[PDB]
């Protein structure tokens, strides 16, 4: 398919189609998960559904879950579609398109939250915060369902990252490990941190509160962000101040 | 029952009953877990034995083994409704109590460690070690079975939380993302801090070292404490220093 | 057996022995992971294999994985019994040989990623990279399958561990809980740490880039290390400077 979506996907197919013949062990696991499928939707659906099964929810329920989010919401594939390019172009690992959607647990974990985040936005709150649950224990990933999360988004070493109720992340933002946008330890309301378009986060880098953080900024690893940091500006230290 | 312990396993079932009706894809196991049950002591024991069970451990042997302990220890139940009311009352996100019960992984690795302390103490120390790697695993709370904590506990995104063999934390304390309560890499004897009550120790602080956190004190975000905090201030920074 | 991985494995299944005769909960695990077998090649193989599993990748296929590496990889044993020796000894919970094999999540995903590293020299880097991935999963150790470690290994508290895809360790180095070896963002290329011999790395220090960790050096707790240490020198700090 020429479209972008379609060009995409048809290298995912040509990726494990390769990994396949190459990997005896692999090869049925990528068959049923990629190969045997003929949409990008209905192949991230079918493994998102087995990697976040549990004794309480069936593998076939998430699976159906996920797809009928998917089919349902063409912001949701276009997001994902999105997420993939920005690995592509951004991942320092260099990872291919079908690595990604299979083994990146920050790609996956950020595509099952924003079906999380359109349950919690369509009235079923306890099933949103079960996903989130799942993606939790699963993915490394505690990104609060009621979080609003734009489109190419990087994560880097997913594990431990934590995004709480009221933070906003904009588009072609970068997260890497153990990143926090939480709180002080207040309670309710309007409490996490709003992160611009563009913004890279370095490892390990603490956002606490109701704060700012501007269009196309750093913000260095280990960083301890208390107070705004301007647009295309660089903060940096424990605490963090402007370089 | 209009006991307080009673009255807050009514607030469960109550809330459980609208969670099953309004979401059915959740609702056998709202009723499994606690609509079918009588008390909170066996439906908390039913609920950690499914989520901790293993090829090594059954959920079966599980709930017995969290059912004997809450059924012969009054302190384990007073410390579960402590835990349940601290939630309640301090949770910056609000939680509801069955919420608490079911999807707090903090709340759960609690009151799972309480069990393996008790195993601890009563020369069980295979089984508390077995039971402490399972609560480590499920919920990535690694709290040393032989560490004492007392009740009234909150946790908040309790993953990555550490608390050392040698430990002590009062009551009434909270405890923020990514803490450590831990030692330098001395080999053995005491060598972890003790947290007084009423204590509040901001995300990704670490307390390293057999050292004094004094009542009522606060450990700012990010901090690394290194000497003893007087009762009632605040210690922030890298070192950390009294405010 | 009078040998030193001989004597090791002798005090294995006498430590085993009493575990499993003073637990009933825990005997037939203990038989069948250790008591049953003859070397700690093959009990390591059969333990790896139960705690990786996926229903992606049978326990006997693991199995089998582990075992074929252990007997044709005479390093591979060596390694495993200095990275014991290394726990034994170093360990500040003073941890028994039996339970460092059977709980030791550090010790477990750095055998289980010395195979990972293997599979990816012998060019089968999906079936690698799919063994760290699990690896990721259920130790909460992230080390990609690239990355080059020494033996006499130590871990504490290796929940959240990550080392990067071109970071290099060597023998006998400490890494305690939450240390980071990683990049700044960067992609490509050679991007992460070398850690000479000896090295001790504090809890929750960060070391990004592709610098020189001297041997015998010690990076204090809390670290953010951005330039070379010199040999057996101190650095702490965010960022670290040398004391």
């Given at each position: 398919?020429?479209?972008?979506?379609?060009?995409?996907?048809?290298?995912?197919?040509?990726?494990?189609?390769?990994?396949?013949?190459?990997?005896?062990?692999?090869?049925?696991?990528?068959?049923?998960?990629?190969?045997?499928?003929?949409?990008?939707?209905?192949?991230?659906?079918?493994?998102?559904?087995?990697?976040?099964?549990?004794?309480?929810?069936?593998?076939?329920?998430?699976?159906?879950?996920?797809?009928?989010?998917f089919s349902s919401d063409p912001s949701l594939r276009?997001?994902?579609?999105?997420?993939?390019?920005?690995?592509?172009?951004?991942?320092?690992?260099?990872?291919?398109?079908?690595?990604?959607?299979?083994?990146?647990?920050?790609?996956?974990?950020?595509?099952?939250?924003?079906?999380?985040?359109?349950?919690?936005?369509?009235?079923?709150?306890?099933?949103?915060?079960?996903?989130?649950?799942?993606?939790?224990?699963?993915?490394?990933?505690?990104?609060?369902?009621?979080?609003?999360?734009?489109?190419?988004?990087?994560?880097?070493?997913?594990?431990?990252?934590?995004?709480?109720?009221?933070?906003?992340?904009?588009?072609?933002?970068?997260?890497?490990?153990?990143?926090?946008?939480?709180?002080?330890?207040?309670?309710?309301?309007?409490?996490?941190?709003?992160?611009?378009?563009?913004?890279?986060?370095?490892?390990?880098?603490?956002?606490?509160?109701?704060?700012?953080?501007?269009?196309?900024?750093?913000?260095?690893?280990?960083?301890?962000?208390?107070?705004?940091?301007?647009?295309?500006?660089?903060?940096?230290?424990?605490?963090?101040?402007?370089?």
């Amino acid at each position: 398919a020429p479209d972008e979506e379609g060009w995409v996907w048809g290298q995912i197919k040509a990726e494990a189609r390769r990994d396949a013949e190459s990997e005896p062990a692999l090869a049925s696991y990528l068959y049923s998960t990629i190969l045997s499928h003929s949409s990008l939707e209905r192949s991230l659906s079918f493994h998102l559904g087995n990697k976040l099964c549990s004794s309480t929810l069936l593998s076939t329920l998430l699976y159906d879950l996920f797809l009928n989010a998917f089919s349902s919401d063409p912001s949701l594939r276009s997001a994902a579609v999105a997420d993939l390019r920005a690995a592509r172009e951004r991942d320092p690992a260099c990872v291919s398109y079908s690595h990604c959607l299979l083994n990146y647990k920050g790609f996956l974990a950020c595509q099952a939250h924003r079906v999380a985040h359109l349950l919690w936005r369509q009235s079923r709150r306890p099933l949103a915060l079960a996903l989130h649950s799942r993606i939790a224990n699963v993915f490394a990933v505690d990104i609060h369902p009621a979080a609003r999360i734009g489109k190419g988004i990087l994560f880097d070493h997913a594990t431990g990252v934590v995004v709480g109720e009221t933070a906003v992340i904009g588009n072609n933002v970068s997260i890497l490990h153990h990143v926090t946008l939480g709180g002080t330890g207040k309670v309710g309301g309007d409490r996490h941190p709003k992160i611009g378009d563009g913004v890279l986060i370095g490892a390990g880098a603490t956002i606490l509160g109701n704060i700012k953080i501007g269009e196309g900024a750093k913000v260095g690893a280990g960083s301890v962000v208390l107070i705004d940091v301007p647009p295309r500006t660089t903060a940096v230290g424990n605490p963090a101040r402007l370089v």
